[PDB]
A paper describes a structure:
Coxsackie virus B5 (CVB5) is a member of Enterovirus-B (EV-B) species, which can cause various human diseases, such as viral encephalitis; herpangina; hand, foot, and mouth disease (HFMD); aseptic meningitis; and acute flaccid paralysis (1–3). Similar to other EV-B species, CVB5 is a nonenveloped, positive-sense single-strand RNA (+ssRNA) virus. P2, and P3 will break down into nonstructural proteins responsible for genome replication, whereas P1 is the precursor form of structural proteins VP1-VP4, which could be packaged into an icosahedral capsid. Here, we determined the atomic structures of CVB5 in three forms: mature full (F) particle (2.73 Å), intermediate altered (A) particle (2.81 Å), and procapsid empty (E) particle (2.95 Å).
In agreement with the results from AUC and EM, after data processing, three distinctive maps corresponding to F, A and E particles were reconstructed and refined to the resolutions of 2.73 Å, 2.81 Å, and 2.95 Å, respectively, according to the Fourier shell correlation at a threshold of 0.143, which allowed an atomic model for the majority of the main chains and sides chains to be manually fitted or built in. Compared with the map of the F particle, both maps of A and E particles had an expansion of ~4% with large openings on the 2-fold axes. Comparing the compact CVB5 F particle with the expanded A particle, we found that the expansion of CVB5 was largely attributable to the tectonic movements of viral proteins, accompanied by a ~5.5° counterclockwise rotation of the protomeric building unit pivoting about the 3-fold axis and a ~7 Å shift away of VP1 and VP3 from the particle center. This movement results in a more elongated structure and broadening of the surface mesa. Furthermore, the whole GH loop of VP3 seems to shift from its position. We noted that the first seven residues of VP1 visualized on A particle would traverse the capsid and stop on the surface of the capsid, which was distinctive from the E particle where the corresponding residues were disordered, and all the other remaining residues were present on the interior of the capsid. Based on the previous studies on enteroviruses, it is reasonable to deduce that with the particle expansion, the GH loop of VP3 moved upward from the quasi-3-fold hole to form the classic β-hairpin structure to obstruct the off-axis channels and aid in the widening of the 2-fold helices (residues 90 to 98) connecting the C and D strands of VP2. This rearrangement likely spared enough room allowing the extension of VP1 N-terminus to pass through the inner surface to reach the 2-fold gate and later slip into the quasi-3-fold hole, reminiscent of what has been proposed in other enteroviruses (i.e. EV71, E30, CVA16, and poliovirus).
Numbering used by the authors:
A (entry chain 3), E (entry chain 3): 1 to 177, 185 to 238
B (entry chain 2): 12 to 259
C (entry chain 1), D (entry chain 1): 49 to 281
């Protein structure tokens, strides 16, 4: 026959190989594909979907729905911080378990722009101003409302619009396995209401992926454990 | 004749027909967007930093070994560009290095003016790493030695190995310029930004060092000045920093 | 670690194909060359819900459609015994794929081994590992990773389960004993989905899995806790 | 010797590709089939600074960009013991490449062995030596052979080091013990850079290397000495 | 399948083989190349660069910078030899550790033309003449200034030019593992100065590769040693 040499790497099983395999059941007619709605070709499609951020991770709240609810005090000190979390979608526990965070925790390297949406869930008659401050990586979290105003920020007027959208340009991953940027909110004004409401207003946070994320090295997620067989 | 060069609020004078060594043949340039890349890594240039910075002159003597500066660190306290290093996390810039030498026709000596990229230096103690102070003193020159240095965390500053474990006579592989007092008194090296990444933190990493090593010792006639000033003038070129504004 | 680098917007392996077409070890069992009562054979019902990582990755979708590329890594070790002068010839193994609804072997010498409609591969040790591919074998249009229904409505324990996700069962045994001594072989089945289609994406599983055939869970916190909502010092 | 011959101006193998794309032995380790505490496995962090010849050749440049073509020469020898009638079947070895930032095996039976994102090659003895290729795995644009900086500025011992030159770690172990007797295997990893790009040439190292992770050196003379500067008699 | 014969040499590992290898990490997107200045494609580029020659290899000088400095005596005997070394870029310790010598010591066979540059580093007012004499291989080193003048030589006038460039046509290697040519300098005149300088003038030597070198058989350099493992 044709003279050949087997070459190093023959008769080896590399698990990450793309060799054709013999069909165990040839001459069997598989059922044709039927058009199921919701076909997904890429995990970024799930990543790009808004997911509610549990900003209120204080002790005793992660087991209840009010971990997603940012409390807004009616009688609060002027210029105080409403909320603030490190801007690490994969490391910080605030953004870690969201859809974008779950997608990112499947890959070693990633970089892109996140989209943060804050929705005010008070009464339509309520009026107030918030100062959403973005700190670039390495800058550090601002300590006063004035330092926040002197940096990148938006004045979120509750009376005019009940939702605010922020796109953060420099995200990236931070480790193979601080100094990542911060997003903070401040009381520019207080929340003004016509009548006396016993309960305080709440703010809902949403994180999402913009079209510019890459993911490069798939790995095992750190949020599932299997230490023994099921049988 | 003589050519005067002004950058910002600083002016220097250089002789015409003076050779300029342009790095590795590459003039410093700004970073280029790759097919209209997204605003995920915005870049911010600064043109106010494109000015001459003049370090304090180092006194070249008869028994004087070399000097060196690490210019990311050597300009870290020179007003602007130092404030820019402090304020911005990622930085990128090239430099124009002017090395002047004030000597009369009765002076002798030769100097190797070389800009060594990634000049990682060893320690005097084998099982140690040199400290920040010994490696780079900022605007103050660090001096080579005529013998082995002693110190727990001191740089091995013996001039024969240039602190890198190589032959000092083979340092000409890097962008260099010889200063022979009978022929030359100036050296102009234009160093492009050289790194393995487009931008990097500047406090945390030195792109290159400038070594001024007297190969032929300084000499003079009786009555002439026993020392000769060596002036280093630096103009940062095409300084870029990470954009601080919100992407949207 | 992992300093800031340029973003090249590589979506290449974020696709479902590169996300799921990874060869993962899903099962390993041992069987002896000699058996007490003809039970010296290994078997594995093909399921994607035993390994918690592949299960989570697949359950990030509602419906899937893929091929079953199975690779078997059979290694035999000689156990300690008083038998001397064994000199075992080379060992041959039989790996049977029982299609859904096919005859099921009961012992190591059952008639279901010497059938005709169950694909079987005979592999002799010292060669490349055996490899067979199973097509999309369901009579439905896709594999349902979740089923909000019952196999029989009048049965409590049939919730979920479905009946169209049956992918068959694998059976492994020694063709020849080789020597009159103890030999035990491990199969170490490697699973790799091929030509994957997925529909209706789902949130990733948050609570640790309890059973392979259940979605039952102990309620867990949505994320880890932190001391303060504000980043104040 | 080497009389005067014609100069044909062959620059062919003076190129960086022919200068560096040479297969060199960079590591060799031994591991037993049976282990005292599950530590019977070999490992090597992929570094180009352990062999002083390849290190010098690579450090004649500042930045490099190459692929890692690794060839493993596994040979097993049976140690002397009182066990009789071993009759070991053929031995299979597993060589795992842990990518930068991947799970690290601690013992011979750790979960990191049976992972999914660490490329593993299973090679049975008696065949051609196993071979795997690692691409340019850095997130930077090149491998920096020198680094005049710190991994962390506020740390003394982080000078040099960098964080982008991590090429991963190799792990070697026995898939099967074969026989109930002592068997020790040597891996003898062979390294060969591929598709090499190099920038910013540097003077060759003059002082002997002291540590693999250092540039520290004992000062040495620029060359050997001679009696007289003049060639007089 | 297709009938083939394995042929002798199959299943062998020849370390100097150019067979394609299976990628351990396929479907991983490597970072694109970025234009780093100073790209090198050939070691001759390093060889062609001027390197300072340590001509003054006398005992006690190789550990100091003054091994590269050729001393020029103001009050020296007329017709004396300033310096002289065998013209072996790979064998003689004078040229051995230079850039060209280091490149050549990586290859078994080489041949070409070296370029020698001598730079006078005295005062601009200094004046003198030197006689750079080239002896072909097998000729032997000249013993007087007259024998040097009767051979190949250049009169290096310090007053006119402070640098002299010499290209040597017949270099080649000398061994697999005298009679190679010589270059010598002689005092044609003395060094004349206007005023009294206490220190003597120095001459710097530079060696370089011309475009006509070949290198044919790569080998291990003899200037690095590793007798034990680092771990």
């Amino acid at each position: 026959g044709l003279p050949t040499m087997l070459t190093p790497g023959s008769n080896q099983f590399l698990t990450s190989d793309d060799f054709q395999s013999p069909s165990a059941m040839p001459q069997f007619d598989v059922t044709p594909e039927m058009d199921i709605p919701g076909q997904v070709n890429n995990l970024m499609e799930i990543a790009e979907v808004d997911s509610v951020v549990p900003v209120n991770n204080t002790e005793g709240k992660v087991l209840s729905i009010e971990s997603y609810q940012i409390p807004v005090q009616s009688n609060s000190t002027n210029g105080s911080q409403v909320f603030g979390f490190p801007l690490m979608p994969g490391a910080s526990s605030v953004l870690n378990r969201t859809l974008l965070g779950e997608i990112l925790n499947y890959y070693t390297h990633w970089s892109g722009s996140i989209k943060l949406t804050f929705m005010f869930c008070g009464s339509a008659m309520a009026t107030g101003k918030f100062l959403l401050a973005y700190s670039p990586p390495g800058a550090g979290a601002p300590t006063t409302r004035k330092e926040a105003m002197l940096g990148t920020h938006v004045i979120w007027d509750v009376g005019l619009q009940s939702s605010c959208v922020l796109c953060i340009p420099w995200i990236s991953q931070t480790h193979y396995r601080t100094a990542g940027g911060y997003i903070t909110c401040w009381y520019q004004t207080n929340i003004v209401v016509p009548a006396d409401t016993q309960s305080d207003c709440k703010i809902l946070c949403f994180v999402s992926a913009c079209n510019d994320f890459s993911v490069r090295m798939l790995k095992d997620t750190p949020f599932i454990k299997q230490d023994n067989f099921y049988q | 004749r003589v050519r005067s060069i002004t950058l910002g609020n600083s002016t220097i004078t250089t002789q015409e027909c003076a050779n300029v060594v342009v790095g590795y043949g590459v003039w410093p340039t700004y970073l280029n967007d790759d097919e209209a890349t997204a605003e995920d890594q915005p870049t911010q240039p600064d043109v106010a930093t494109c000015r001459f910075y003049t370090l304090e002159s180092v006194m070249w003597q008869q028994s004087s070994p070399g000097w060196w500066w690490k210019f990311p660190d050597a300009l870290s306290n020179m007003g602007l560009f130092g404030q820019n290093m402090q304020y911005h996390y990622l930085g990128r810039a090239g430099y124009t290095v002017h090395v002047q030498c004030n000597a009369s026709k009765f002076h002798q000596g030769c100097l190797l003016v070389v800009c060594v990229p990634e000049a990682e230096m060893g320690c005097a103690t084998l099982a140690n790493k040199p400290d920040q102070k010994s490696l780079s003193n900022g605007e103050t020159a660090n001096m080579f030695e005529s013998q082995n240095s002693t110190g727990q965390t001191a740089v091995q500053a013996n001039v024969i190995n240039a602190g890198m474990g190589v032959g000092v006579g083979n340092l000409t592989i890097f962008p260099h310029q010889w200063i022979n007092l009978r022929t030359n008194n100036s050296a102009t090296i234009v160093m492009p930004y050289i790194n393995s990444v487009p931008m990097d933190n500047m406090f945390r990493h030195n792109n290159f060092t400038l070594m001024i090593i007297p190969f032929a010792p300084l000499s003079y006639s009786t009555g002439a000045t026993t020392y000769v000033p060596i002036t280093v003038t630096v103009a940062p070129m095409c300084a870029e920093y990470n954009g601080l504004r919100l992407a949207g | 670690q992992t300093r800031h680098v340029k973003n090249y917007h590589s979506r290449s392996e974020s696709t479902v194909e590169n996300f799921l077409c990874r060869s993962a070890c899903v099962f390993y069992t041992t069987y002896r060359n000699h058996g007490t009562d003809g039970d010296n054979f290994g078997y594995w019902v093909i399921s994607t819900r035993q390994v918690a990582q592949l299960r989570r990755k697949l359950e990030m979708f509602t419906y899937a459609r893929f091929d079953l590329e199975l690779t078997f890594v059979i290694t035999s070790t000689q156990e300690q015994s008083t038998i001397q002068g064994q000199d075992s010839p080379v060992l041959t193994h039989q790996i049977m794929y029982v299609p859904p609804g096919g005859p099921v072997p009961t012992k190591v010498n059952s008639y279901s081994w010497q059938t005709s409609t169950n694909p079987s591969v005979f592999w002799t040790e010292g060669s490349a590992p055996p490899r067979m591919s199973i097509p999309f074998i369901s009579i439905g249009n896709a594999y349902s990773m979740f089923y909000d229904g019952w196999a029989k409505f009048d049965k409590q324990g049939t919730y979920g389960i479905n009946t169209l996700n049956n992918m068959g069962t694998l059976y492994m045994r020694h063709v020849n004993d080789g020597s009159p001594g103890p030999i035990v072989s491990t199969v170490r089945i490697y699973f790799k989905p091929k030509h994957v289609k997925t529909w209706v994406p789902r949130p990733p599983r948050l609570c640790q899995y309890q059973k392979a055939g259940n979605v039952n869970f102990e309620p867990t916190g949505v994320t880890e806790s932190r001391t303060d909502i504000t980043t104040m010092q």
